[PDB]
Design a binder for this molecule. Structure first.
Ligand SMILES: Nc1nc2c(ncn2[C@@H]2O[C@@H]3COP(=O)(O)O[C@H]4[C@@H](O)[C@H](n5cnc6c(N)ncnc65)O[C@@H]4COP(=O)(O)O[C@H]2[C@@H]3O)c(=O)[nH]1
Lengths: 178, 178
């Protein structure tokens, strides 16, 4: 299954590698690089899962209330022959009524971009209906992996959505629960 | 198909992104950072495809004649909400009879590590026989993608192998053809 392989590669090649050290990288940022007068970055990696697989490269293009602020400390390591491969994450501010209502580590799940592009390339033999069903299967498999995964211990939140709708608000709703 | 999705994600999320700018990054290295007295780095990205999916993180652990030298200039760009995500590659020297017989950009195809780990995790429902058959399907799909891909224009070489056997020699054989 396309989505089954994609869900497992996202855990094996990314989540299980960065989640153990995520809270440490955030506490490091909150103490030494975060502006002294600002709210602390929240402790979890928030992952956006648009089921229509529309994954823009700039998050501020999906909502103007979502604005880039800073990058976490970079995590590097040797991986499949690549020396010091860089895993980077970005901190965003979420604006409500124009003012900062919260800060969090936010990104899209990249494998959804793969399902999108696969639906566009003829040689992939992958229809736009395949995409919606595989997008849902990808998220189910992922939350099933992370439930049993030892690396996910209150440090990761999946935010699936389908499109009116405000992404900045959908994130803030999860953020306000904690 | 697990390998079908993995082969397409490797093209969409990596090869089609780095191959257009690979030769430019190599010429930049050969002129400004390569030691003036050394042989030029070859122009292609050589990708190792062990069908047993044994992908060590340090290439020198698979063969002592393969020694790290330097990194190419890093390629950065915004991707799925990650600002300045870093794509890095490593240059290796290949020793024959103890002396440098060639230099090239070399790495393993990371999705093979995914197939390996999937075969080890019970929740993946993926047997070691599934792995060998999916490993072969992954490479077939990949070379079929790159044949028709506009980004692959004499800048990428797939080296599939199955294990005596010397990895440094198998690479040098491809290198000596050109
Ligand atoms: N050698 C090498 N291969 C790379 C690199 N980046 C991607 N690949 C490969 O391309 C394929 C698809 O790319 P994608 O981002 O869709 O999936 C990635 C992506 O969702 C997530 N991920 C991995 N590294 C990062 C990262 N640095 N930043 C954000 N997300 C990441 O986990 C998935 C699996 O990662 P893997 O690791 O196996 O790299 C393979 C991947 O199979 C790279 O920088 N170096």
């Amino acid at each position: 299954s396309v989505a089954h392989g994609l869900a497992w590669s996202y855990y094996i090649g990314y989540l299980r590698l960065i989640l153990p050290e995520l809270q440490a990288r955030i506490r490091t940022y909150n103490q030494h690089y975060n502006n002294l007068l600002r709210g602390a970055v929240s402790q979890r990696l928030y992952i956006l899962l648009p089921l229509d697989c529309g994954v823009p490269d700039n998050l501020s293009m999906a909502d103007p209330n979502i604005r880039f602020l800073d990058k976490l400390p970079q995590q590097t390591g040797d991986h499949a022959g690549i020396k010091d491969r860089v895993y980077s994450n970005s901190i965003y501010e979420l604006l409500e009524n124009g003012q900062r209502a919260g800060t969090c580590v936010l990104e899209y799940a990249t494998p959804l971009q793969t399902l999108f592009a696969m639906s566009q390339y003829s040689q992939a033999g992958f229809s736009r209906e395949d995409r919606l069903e595989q997008a849902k299967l990808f998220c189910r498999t992922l939350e099933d992996i992370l439930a049993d995964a030892p690396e996910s211990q209150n440090n990761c939140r999946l935010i699936a959505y389908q499109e009116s709708f405000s992404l900045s608000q959908e994130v803030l709703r999860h953020l306000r629960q904690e």
